[PDB]
Amino acid sequence: SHMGTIEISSPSKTHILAFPFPEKGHINPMLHLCNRLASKGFRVTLITTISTYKDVKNKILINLESIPDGTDKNGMNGYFNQFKNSVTESVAGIIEEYKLGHDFPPPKVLIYDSTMPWMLDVAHGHGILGASLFTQPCCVSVVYYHMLQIDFHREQSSSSKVLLLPCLPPLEDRDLPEFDYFKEDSGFVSNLLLNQFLNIDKIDYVLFNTFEMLESEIANWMSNKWKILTIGPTAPTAAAATEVCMKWLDEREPNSVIYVSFGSIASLTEQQMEEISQALFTTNFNFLWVVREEERTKLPNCLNPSSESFTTAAGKLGLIINWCPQLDVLRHESVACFMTHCGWNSTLEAISSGVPMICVPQWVDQTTNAKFIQDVWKIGVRVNNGLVKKEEIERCIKEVCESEKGKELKRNAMKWKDLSKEAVSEGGSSDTNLEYFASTLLFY
Numbered sequence: 001s002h003m004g005t006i007e008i009s010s011p012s013k014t015h016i017l018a019f020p021f022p023e024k025g026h027i028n029p030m031l032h033l034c035n036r037l038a039s040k041g042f043r044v045t046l047i048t049t050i051s052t053y054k055d056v057k058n059k060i061l062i063n064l065e066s067i068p069d070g071t072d073k074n075g076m077n078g079y080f081n082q083f084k085n086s087v088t089e090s091v092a093g094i095i096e097e098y099k100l101g102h103d104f105p106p107p108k109v110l111i112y113d114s115t116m117p118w119m120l121d122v123a124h125g126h127g128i129l130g131a132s133l134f135t136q137p138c139c140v141s142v143v144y145y146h147m148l149q150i151d152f153h154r155e156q157s158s159s160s161k162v163l164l165l166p167c168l169p170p171l172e173d174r175d176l177p178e179f180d181y182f183k184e185d186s187g188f189v190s191n192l193l194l195n196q197f198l199n200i201d202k203i204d205y206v207l208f209n210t211f212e213m214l215e216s217e218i219a220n221w222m223s224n225k226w227k228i229l230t231i232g233p234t235a236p237t238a239a240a241a242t243e244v245c246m247k248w249l250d251e252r253e254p255n256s257v258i259y260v261s262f263g264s265i266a267s268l269t270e271q272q273m274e275e276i277s278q279a280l281f282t283t284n285f286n287f288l289w290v291v292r293e294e295e296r297t298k299l300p301n302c303l304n305p306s307s308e309s310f311t312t313a314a315g316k317l318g319l320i321i322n323w324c325p326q327l328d329v330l331r332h333e334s335v336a337c338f339m340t341h342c343g344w345n346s347t348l349e350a351i352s353s354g355v356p357m358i359c360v361p362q363w364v365d366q367t368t369n370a371k372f373i374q375d376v377w378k379i380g381v382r383v384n385n386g387l388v389k390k391e392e393i394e395r396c397i398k399e400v401c402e403s404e405k406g407k408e409l410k411r412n413a414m415k416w417k418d419l420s421k422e423a424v425s426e427g428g429s430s431d432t433n434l435e436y437f438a439s440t441l442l443f444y
Contacts, residue, residue: 009442011041015105021113022049024264025345029135029209032234076185095126114196131205136344138215140368148194167217175371181363211423211430229433233352237421238331245324252334260339261290266362274300279393287318330355337400342366354417356380356409358396379413
């Protein structure tokens with residue numbers, strides 16, 4: 001009971017590495033997760049490609065490392081095999097660098113994006129743990145697992161099919177993840193999502209950016225087969241909480257603005273932009289529409305400039321800009337509704353902000369997300385297509401923003417916002433699940 005040495009394993013001397021897929025909808029939830037882990041006292045190193053480096057630097061507590069992009073921006077197949085080979089070697093080099101250094105503790109775990117399942121082999125090959133971060137809901141993820149293991153081929157010209165899977169609502173053909181859009185790349189993109197599950201039984205921690213109450217039935221079904229950890233939303237709560245948009249919104253009336261954004265990847269046709277634009281210039285609401293630089297040329301002729309300001313045909317005001325801080329915009333009192341492509345990150349940010357949506361999904365998980373938004377969570381409405389006509393967009397805007405049903409959708413969205421806040425506050429399922437991840441890292 002005298003003489004000896006105590007050894008203490010604590011967050012302050014535990015080093016977590018994190019590597020998102022290089023897209024903003026994958027980067028942002030990873031980055032918020034890193035901030036939460038650093039708040040518990042962990043040493044956290046975020047790794048990202050050099051072309052996404054500056055964006056991450058502006059948003060950040062967190063040690064940041066760059067790696068080569070590993071791709072040429074100009075075929076989908078050649079894009080991937082060279083990406084995988086490049087990032088495998090560069091992340092491997094980072095792991096050994098920190099294993100041998102003295103400023104940081106050696107890495108204990110790599111958190112990697114679930115679409116990059118070969119990074120589990122990198123982590124284990126270097127003697128560290130691997131945590132797969134799914135930036136998709138449980139419901140659509142299970143659909144990919146079933147596809148990996150029922151006939152998901154559809155003709156749909158000759159009949160309609162409705163698919164029943166355990167602990168999911170019936171899925172019509174338009175509710176399935178959309179891969180046919182990619183034409184000759186359809187099997188490739190399909191494989192990328194299906195292969196998230198190739199090694200799931202070997203992953204040390206399976207992390208989902210969702211919260212248990214939002215997906216109770218399917219999350220339990222998953223939790224029995226695998227010990228999944230729902231840890232979302234990773235973003236800070238609205239309660240707990242980039243200049244141009246905020247100044248404009250501050251000058252608008254409460255609940256007066258339709259916020260419009262189709263994400264950083266989707267590219268709509270010229271005709272589709274014209275339909276959206278004509279609906280927006282004739283509604284009874286103000287609008288804020290994010291259109292990336294490269295997408296500007298597909299706007300109608302009558303409307304290069306980074307931003308443009310409008311008085312609409314109905315006497316309202318509009319702003320087109322290249323970029324905005326979406327979570328701050330969604331939590332601005334001026335915003336009435338969110339016209340969205342229904343990517344999961346955007347969908348969950350809207351849920352955590354209490355904003356109802358007009359769903360205009362384009363591909364992969366966006367269609368399934370739209371199904372759940374309209375019919376399960378009941379916080380939005382989905383357009384009917386495949387060009388969506390201005391009269392159909394107008395119809396959904398009036399339903400969400402003007403009608404009594406719209407008032408119910410808003411109430412539902414405020415309910416789900418409070419439940420998302422419950423999840424990540426002390427005692428909530430996501431706070432509990434994230435502390436389980438953090439604390440067991442200290443044992444291992």
